[PDB]
Design a binder for this molecule. Sequence first.
Ligand SMILES: NC(=O)c1ccc[n+]([C@@H]2O[C@H](COP(=O)([O-])OP(=O)(O)OC[C@H]3O[C@@H](n4cnc5c(N)ncnc54)[C@H](OP(=O)(O)O)[C@@H]3O)[C@@H](O)[C@H]2O)c1
Ligand SMILES: Cc1ccc(Cl)c(Nc2ccccc2C(=O)O)c1Cl
Length: 303
Amino acid sequence: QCVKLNDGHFMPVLGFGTYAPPEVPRSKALEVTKLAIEAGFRHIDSAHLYNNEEQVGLAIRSKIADGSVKREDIFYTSKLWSTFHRPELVRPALENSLKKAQLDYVDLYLIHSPMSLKPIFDIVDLCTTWEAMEKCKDAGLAKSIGVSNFNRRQLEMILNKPGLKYKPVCNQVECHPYFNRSKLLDFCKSKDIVLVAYSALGSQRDKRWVDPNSPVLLEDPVLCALAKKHKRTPALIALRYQLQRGVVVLAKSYNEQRIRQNVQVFEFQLTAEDMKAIDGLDRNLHYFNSDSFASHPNYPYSD
Ligand SMILES: NC(=O)c1ccc[n+]([C@@H]2O[C@H](COP(=O)([O-])OP(=O)(O)OC[C@H]3O[C@@H](n4cnc5c(N)ncnc54)[C@H](OP(=O)(O)O)[C@@H]3O)[C@@H](O)[C@H]2O)c1
Ligand SMILES: Cc1ccc(Cl)c(Nc2ccccc2C(=O)O)c1Cl
């Protein structure tokens, strides 16, 4: 199913994560994005950063061409990279992502991160970036626009902007049972802004930003015990948890069995006691924990 965004467009509540590290050949993105769509995924999450938009776009066009889905059945997201926050660069960055994917529009375009980088850190008024995003929705390049990696204060700056035309429809952020973002989720609900969870399965644990000593979410004993009770898997429990909280959840998998497994999130439900047990795992733990973000003036977790 779908959630109605605050601009009247609809977003599928389970999305397919397409990021893979650079050691995975670029051709894999094409193959697994096809498999995801075959499995039942209708929301596909990509970004300029991922260096896969040509493959992801080809998978979508491929599944349109062979007749499995129509373009309006697919919800495709791309994201403005942090070297393109200066307002005059926004629309050209978007049109480029479009030309790569060979699509006429994205369903959603996000500001990937509030941490501006030189076109080295940069200082940009993200309110001007936002105006440029608004112009992209007006031109029909993006059906909806939103943000990613914004904390409550950063999100407030946009919402409070003089002559704001469109609220962000969502804030895509790190979110899972060890970092459940409860307070930010309540703030977003109060504003009819959807929270979209990434690393909802505990991240890819890439050594470039994640400490390998960090706990492994999918071996959590409470998650294992609920998977046993429901006869599902720890990943399924972690995804269902977000859906029942009114959180749109992404799931990356480049594995054919796990891709098909993940759409089973719709086939069962958790009780209030289950949800409380998961809620009790929260431990303020963000897996991405790197000097490369932490020292930025607009680091979202400076809290
Ligand atoms: N906005 C941002 O700054 C940001 C940041 C991070 C991620 N994202 C978006 O969110 C997407 C997902 O987040 P993520 O990449 O951190 O990964 P994720 O969804 O947390 O998944 C982490 C690992 O879970 C494994 N997995 C998937 N399904 C599973 C299952 N059923 N059972 C066991 N393991 C399973 C996958 O390994 P296999 O591939 O081997 O199955 C995957 O590498 C990204 O791909 C990207 O689209 C955005
Ligand atoms: C904290 C933070 C800040 C900025 C970005 Cl862009 C990201 N996103 C990524 C970082 C490294 C590799 C992939 C991503 C992603 O968007 O998937 C995160 Cl996790």
